[PDB]
Amino acid sequence: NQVLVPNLNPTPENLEVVGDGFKITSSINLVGEEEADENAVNALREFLTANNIEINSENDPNSTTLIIGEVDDDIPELDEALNGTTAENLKEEGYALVSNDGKIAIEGKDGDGTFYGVQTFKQLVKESNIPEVNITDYPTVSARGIVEGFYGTPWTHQDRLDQIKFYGENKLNTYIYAPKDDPYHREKWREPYPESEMQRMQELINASAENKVDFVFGISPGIDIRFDGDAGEEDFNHLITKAESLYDMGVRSFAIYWDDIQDKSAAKHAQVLNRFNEEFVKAKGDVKPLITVPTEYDTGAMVSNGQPRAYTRIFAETVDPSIEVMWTGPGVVTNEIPLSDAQLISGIYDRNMAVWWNYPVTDYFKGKLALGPMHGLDKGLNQYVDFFTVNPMEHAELSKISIHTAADYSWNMDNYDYDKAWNRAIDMLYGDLAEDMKVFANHSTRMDNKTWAKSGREDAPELRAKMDELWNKLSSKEDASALIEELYGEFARMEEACNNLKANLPEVALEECSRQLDELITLAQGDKASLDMIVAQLNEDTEAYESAKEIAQNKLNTALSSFAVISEKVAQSFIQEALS
Ligand SMILES: FC(F)(F)C1=NCCNC=C1
């Protein structure tokens, strides 16, 4: 029978189904391996090994045939199997994939593209079966990735190697390495890596390249940099020396941060940029565009009554237009970047901008996990933005859910559906546990420290609606009891799911969310007690009510003084509501 197209992330620009599917044989003829991108071919080899698919050395016409290469390779049998499809006319990083009557063909516009075709290929195949499809695919935004920019417990080395492979698998191509643990990033910002630190950095650098990730080395000399006279000169050379020493280990992307600094003059920040850009970036000729974050980096701090402040205005004139400029949106952590905000800032800097989006980062509100999708990001932003990065959580495993959606948003922006993306993330990442994780993660999408920092999808919004509806039914004495029954079932479901997650989540996830699992179980029991209160009072029964009321205060006080935080406006607020 038919072979269905599995979930893919990101969603490819164009995918047509052309056959029923077929089973890839025990082993295959691989064609083009000698001409095609070395990293694409190694990804392919690893996948084939991990799935017990051998490679014939002698062509066997009984065996499935896999042909891989770039446009700029001369592989006639690739064009033959593509049978009309082509990557020739796509942007950079695009590719074409055709799977049909026993052949798979992958043609990248460039090697990045080819590597990305392999990542699609990997997603399409299940228990050796592939659908017969026809894909041409390319990204909306051209830098797409992560900045390691949060505070708190930095990621381990093993976390980073895991993330980088993950970024490659979801077609993210940028990783800004600016950890606050690392002295060689800020304090000690002059000063090459020791010797004891070189083997670690080298592994980060090489893993990145192997997965088509731009390892951007982030530097932050605001701590103590001198701009004037001999000191200015000496420090500029320390900057150059430092970048040379990283150039020498393989680094070909650099970012310079001015976000925390004493001497706060735009003209001086932009001169150090412009000179580095000339004397280093351009001189080397294989270094990617320099990146910077300026001292004013949110619309709040950058603009006043539609007019740039002094800093921004000066920085914006002075700074070379080849330089990439990061800004976080309307504020540092904000609901939205609407098109008008992008336009405004893009206009001022007179260029396509770079986004530093502070979600899912939780460093400002550590008890809550941010497990929701990219949200409030206007689906036309690519008109003014061609570099998009997320600042994730200290919790690397669970950051994968938001990051997975950032991958769809930034690759295929027209078609981005936050809720569809959110479900696909959980489905793809959590397997046999996805339905349970969805129940739980549903209550942990929304960030709000109640001062300055608010972003993300509202928690569990269907359930909020049923809770509001229950209060209307009660307070205009209409019948409520179908709903009450329905809500007993929801709260039971919450508890069931979180218990199943505690029992079955692998440690790598469990250990980042177990406090919250417990917290949501508690609030769920208090929610259950809160309906017990409502039933008791509608049956005028003080015994059952004062008993239930005690149980509900009990769960609320546990949650209120636990470190963990979750479902503040839904599962937690329901209990507060019932007790008033
Ligand atoms: F002020 C600090 F930089 F230390 C800080 N700011 C944002 C909130 N998260 C943790 C620390």
Q: How far is the CA of 365 from the centre of ligand 1 (A)?
A: 10
Q: How far is the CA of 391 from the centre of ligand 1 (A)?
A: 14
Q: How far is the CA of 151 from the centre of ligand 1 (A)?
A: 7
Task: Quote the CA–CA distance of 177 and 108 in Å, as a whole number.
Answer: 28
Fold of the domain built from segment(s) 456-580: Methane Monooxygenase Hydroxylase; Chain G, domain 1 (1.20.58)
Q: Per the annotation, does 363 bind a ligand?
A: yes
Peptide bond into 10 cis (omega under 30): yes
Would you state the structure tokens that stand for residue 65, as one six-digit string?
């045939």
Name the closest-CA residue to atom 4, ligand 1. 151
User: Which single residue is written with the structure tokens 């290929």?
Assistant: 121
Taking only Cα atoms into account, the Rg of the chain, rounded to an integer number of angstroms, comes to 27
Q: With beta carbons less than 8 A apart as the criterion, state whether 346 and 139 touch.
A: no
**Active site residue: 60, 72, 224, 260, which one?**
260
Would you state the structure tokens that stand for residue 489, as one six-digit string?
């079932």
Helices and strands per DSSP (H, E), number in the chain: 19, 21
C-alpha distances in Å from residue 449, one per residue of 174, 269, 334, 358, 403: 29, 32, 12, 14, 22
Q: With beta carbons less than 8 A apart as the criterion, state whether 544 and 496 touch.
A: no
Name the closest-CA residue to atom 8, ligand 1. 364
Helix (H) or strand (E) holding 447: strand 447-448
Q: With beta carbons less than 8 A apart as the criterion, state whether 165 and 42 touch.
A: no
Task: Quote the CA–CA distance of 85 and 99 in Å, as a whole number.
Answer: 11
Torsions phi, psi of 428, nearest 5? -70, -50
Residues near 381 by beta carbon (within 8 Å), at least 6 away in sequence? 337, 339, 342, 355, 388, 413
Q: Hey, which of 180, 186, 364, 394 would you mutate to test ligand 1's pocket, going by the most ligand atoms within 8 Å of its Cβ?
A: 364
Q: What sign for the dihedral angle of Cα 294, 295, 298, 301? A: negative
Q: Per the annotation, does 357 bind a ligand?
A: yes
Q: Which atom of ligand 1 is nearest to the CA of 151?
A: 10
Q: With beta carbons less than 8 A apart as the criterion, state whether 378 and 339 touch.
A: yes
Q: How far is the CA of 272 from the centre of ligand 1 (A)?
A: 27
Would you state the structure tokens that stand for residue 359, as one six-digit string?
């979600």
Annotation says 72 is catalytic: no
Identify the bridge partners of residue 27 per DSSP, sorted by sequence position: 54
Would you state the structure tokens that stand for residue 256, as one six-digit string?
């310079």
Q: What angle do CA 558, 559, 565 make, to 5 degrees?
A: 150
Q: Per the annotation, does 358 bind a ligand?
A: yes
Would you state the structure tokens that stand for residue 11, as one six-digit string?
């969603």
Helix (H, G, I), strand (E, B) or coil at 502: helix
The architecture (CATH level 2) of 1-138 comes to 2-Layer Sandwich (3.30)
Q: How far is the CA of 190 from the centre of ligand 1 (A)?
A: 24
DSSP for residue 570: T
How far separated are the first and last CA of the chain, in Å rounded?
59
Would you state the structure tokens that stand for residue 176, as one six-digit string?
């800004």
Method: X-ray
Helix (H) or strand (E) holding 307: strand 307-308
Name the closest-CA residue to atom 6, ligand 1. 364
Q: With beta carbons less than 8 A apart as the criterion, state whether 141 and 386 touch.
A: yes
Would you state the structure tokens that stand for residue 545, as one six-digit string?
């009510």
Task: Quote the CA–CA distance of 30 and 54 in Å, as a whole number.
Answer: 10
Query: Residue 535 carries which side chain, given as an amino acid letter?
Result: V
Q: Hey, which of 150, 151, 186 would you mutate to test ligand 1's pocket, going by the most ligand atoms within 8 Å of its Cβ?
A: 151
Query: Residue ranges of the domains in the chain?
Result: 1-138, 140-455, 456-580
Helix (H) or strand (E) holding 536: helix 507-538
Fold of the domain built from segment(s) 140-455: TIM Barrel (3.20.20)
DSSP for residue 542: H
Q: Per the annotation, does 149 bind a ligand?
A: yes
Torsions phi, psi of 410, nearest 5? -80, -25
Q: How far is the CA of 152 from the centre of ligand 1 (A)?
A: 9
| Three-class HEC string of 231-255 | HHHHHHHHHHHHHHHHHCCCCCCEE
Whether 1-138 shares its CATH topology with 456-580 is answered: no
C-alpha distances in Å from residue 135, one per residue of 101, 132, 170, 400, 424: 15, 10, 16, 26, 20
Task: Quote the CA–CA distance of 348 and 366 in Å, as a whole number.
Answer: 35
Name the closest-CA residue to atom 3, ligand 1. 151
Alpha helices, H only, 350-480: 396-411, 418-430, 434-441, 461-475
Q: What is the largest CA-CA distance in the chain?
A: 85
Q: How many CB atoms lie within 10 A of CB 419?
A: 12
**Residue (of 392, 357, 369, 328) closest to 155 by Cα position:** 392
Task: Quote the CA–CA distance of 364 and 307 in Å, as a whole number.
Answer: 29
DSSP for residue 382: G
Alpha helices, H only, 83-228: 111-124, 157-169, 198-210
Q: Per the annotation, does 180 bind a ligand?
A: yes
C-alpha distances in Å from residue 152, one per residue of 255, 329, 363: 21, 23, 6
Q: Hey, which of 298, 363, 365, 451 would you mutate to test ligand 1's pocket, going by the most ligand atoms within 8 Å of its Cβ?
A: 363
Q: With beta carbons less than 8 A apart as the criterion, state whether 132 and 17 touch.
A: yes
Helix (H) or strand (E) holding 454: strand 454-455
Identify the bridge partners of residue 126 per DSSP, sorted by sequence position: 129
User: Which single residue is written with the structure tokens 């896999």?
Assistant: 66
Name the closest-CA residue to atom 9, ligand 1. 364
- What is the structure's resolution, reported in angstroms to one decimal? 2.6
Q: Which atom of ligand 1 is nearest to the CA of 260?
A: 3
Query: Residue 90 carries which side chain, given as an amino acid letter?
Result: L
Q: With beta carbons less than 8 A apart as the criterion, state whether 567 and 460 touch.
A: yes
- Ligand 1 neighbours, Cβ below 6 Å, are 151, 363-364
User: Which single residue is written with the structure tokens 């390892």?
Assistant: 215
Peptide bond into 330 cis (omega under 30): no
Q: How far is the CA of 396 from the centre of ligand 1 (A)?
A: 19
Q: Per the annotation, does 436 bind a ligand?
A: no
| Three-class HEC string of 462-485 | HHHHHHHHHHHHHHCCCCCHHHHH
Task: Quote the CA–CA distance of 81 and 445 in Å, as a whole number.
Answer: 45
Q: Which atom of ligand 1 is nearest to the CA of 363?
A: 9
Name the closest-CA residue to atom 7, ligand 1. 364
Burial of 443 (0-12, 13-18, 19+ CB in 10 A): buried
Task: Quote the CA–CA distance of 227 and 225 in Å, as a whole number.
Answer: 7
Task: Quote the CA–CA distance of 527 and 253 in Å, as a whole number.
Answer: 51
Q: Which atom of ligand 1 is nearest to the CA of 152?
A: 10
